[PDB]
Amino acid sequence: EVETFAFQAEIAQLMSLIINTFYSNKEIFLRELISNSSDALDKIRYESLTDPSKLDSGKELHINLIPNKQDRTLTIVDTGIGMTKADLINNLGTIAKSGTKAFMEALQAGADISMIGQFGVGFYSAYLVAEKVTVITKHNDDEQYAWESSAGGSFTVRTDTGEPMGRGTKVILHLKEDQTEYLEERRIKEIVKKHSQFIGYPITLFVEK
Numbered sequence: 001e002v003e004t005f006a007f008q009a010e011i012a013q014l015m016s017l018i019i020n021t022f023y024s025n026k027e028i029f030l031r032e033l034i035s036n037s038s039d040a041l042d043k044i045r046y047e048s049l050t051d052p053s054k055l056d057s058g059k060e061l062h063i064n065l066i067p068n069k070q071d072r073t074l075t076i077v078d079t080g081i082g083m084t085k086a087d088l089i090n091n092l093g094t095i096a097k098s099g100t101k102a103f104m105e106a107l108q109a110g111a112d113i114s115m116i117g118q119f120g121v122g123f124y125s126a127y128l129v130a131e132k133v134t135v136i137t138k139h140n141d142d143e144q145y146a147w148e149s150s151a152g153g154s155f156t157v158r159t160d161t162g163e164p165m166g167r168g169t170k171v172i173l174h175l176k177e178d179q180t181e182y183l184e185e186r187r188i189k190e191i192v193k194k195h196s197q198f199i200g201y202p203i204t205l206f207v208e209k
């Protein structure tokens, strides 16, 4: 059972600005997704201080970067707090509405797309490099869900049947044809070292076979 939803108008507007604006410094997408993973890990770490059973679904707090040249995908996996169905469908998009409006006003004032993180909507920078984004997520209080969008104004959410995650979030970037440089080990290392060197969780860059 796949449910289809319309993005809020302001968020659809942000995604098409991200997709259509000429902007060469696309690598900042990785910093934004890693920062998102770091916050999700902070959240479950804090919550587990007052309730250790919240780590029954997995004690390890880490971030994995998994390129796959065969599928042309880059996956960012974290074992953070995860996202409920209400998060995916409504809550997070609602929060993002005000940061979207502020971000788009700043861009009129001379700001540039690399400051998207200061407005809390860094996730959508994924569409600098991806034609389609799949997010698999599991929160302790909900089931495993798959969110997906190729932009164009709509996203889908379904219950996920694949491998159980335990807890956390997996962002699968289906890369545009001319953005395969972000599948290369030396390029990913360069970006992580430049923008994410002080992230307080182990970041493991997988290599391909």
Ligand SMILES: CCCCNC(=O)N(C)[C@@H]1C[C@@H]2C=C[C@H]1C2
Pocket: 036, 037, 040, 087, 088, 089, 092, 093, 096, 120, 121, 122, 123, 135, 147, 169
């Ligand atoms: C925790 C790492 C992801 C942070 N998520 C966001 O910032 N969102 C706006 C959400 C991602 C999916 C698209 C919209 C919602 C659901």
